[PDB]
Swiss-Prot record:
Tree of life domain: Bacteria
Pfam families found in the cross-reference section: DSBA
Alphabetized UniProt keyword annotations: Disulfide bond, Periplasm, Redox-active center, Signal
Gene name of the encoded protein: dsbA
PROSITE patterns documented for this protein: THIOREDOXIN_1 (PS00194), THIOREDOXIN_2 (PS51352)
GO molecular function, one term: protein-disulfide reductase activity
Protein family: Belongs to the thioredoxin family. DsbA subfamily.
Name used for this protein in its record: Thiol:disulfide interchange protein DsbA
Length: 188
């Protein structure tokens, strides 16, 4: 077949019931994740190839970066609770990987302050049980598939994108193959 298990995607041995339809995992420490954001805009390009209104979910992971990795999962929970993902994604990626100015939880908070989130609002979210539950939700989704690598995308809890099987001589062709694979998997 044109699309084959092991080429553009793999199939989970144990599918996850009730999973998000399109579920992405990333780390702000992850170099390909930085590219998926700033260079390729994978999430945007997948969204454009899917029907309007499809639920896309994006979660942070703990397993890169030790203490700060977990702080960043909690900060991503704050971003989701406040709805400010689009305001903080690029400065968090650049703070961790480009300028390397993010070395502590306080430095993460600085990114939100600079992006216009009030200190009181950030701190109240950071310490809220709503955010505690969002941290648990991110961990559970990753645990459901023993995730050991990012960037990762899962479709309907059943299929995992396999970017290592896609063309990388051309960045736009790669994005198109990735997005068309998501569309194919979503229609299975
Ligand atoms: C999870 C461990 C890493 C393996 O998974 C990959 C392999 C290659 C790529 C490229 C290529 C590009 O666009 O420059 C973008 O993301 C990738 C993820």
């Amino acid at each position: 077949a044109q699309y084959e298990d092991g080429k553009q995607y793999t199939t989970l041995e144990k599918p996850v019931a009730g999973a998000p339809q399109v579920l992405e995992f990333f780390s702000f420490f992850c170099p390909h994740c930085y590219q998926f954001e700033e260079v390729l805009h994978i999430s945007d390009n997948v969204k454009k190839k899917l029907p309007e209104g499809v639920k896309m979910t994006k979660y942070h992971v703990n397993f890169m970066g030790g203490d700060l990795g977990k702080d960043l999962t909690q900060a991503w929970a704050v971003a989701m609770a406040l709805g400010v993902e689009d305001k903080v994604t690029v400065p968090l990626f650049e703070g961790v990987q480009k300028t390397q100015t993010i070395r502590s939880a306080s430095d993460i908070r600085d990114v939100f302050i600079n992006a216009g989130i009030k200190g009181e609002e950030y701190d109240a979210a950071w310490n809220s049980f709503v955010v505690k539950s969002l941290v648990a939700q991110q961990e559970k989704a990753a645990a459901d598939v023993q995730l050991r690598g990012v960037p990762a995308m899962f479709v309907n809890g059943k299929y995992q994108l396999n970017p290592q099987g896609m063309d990388t001589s051309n960045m736009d062709v790669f994005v198109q193959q990735y997005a068309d694979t998501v569309k194919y998997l979503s229609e299975k």
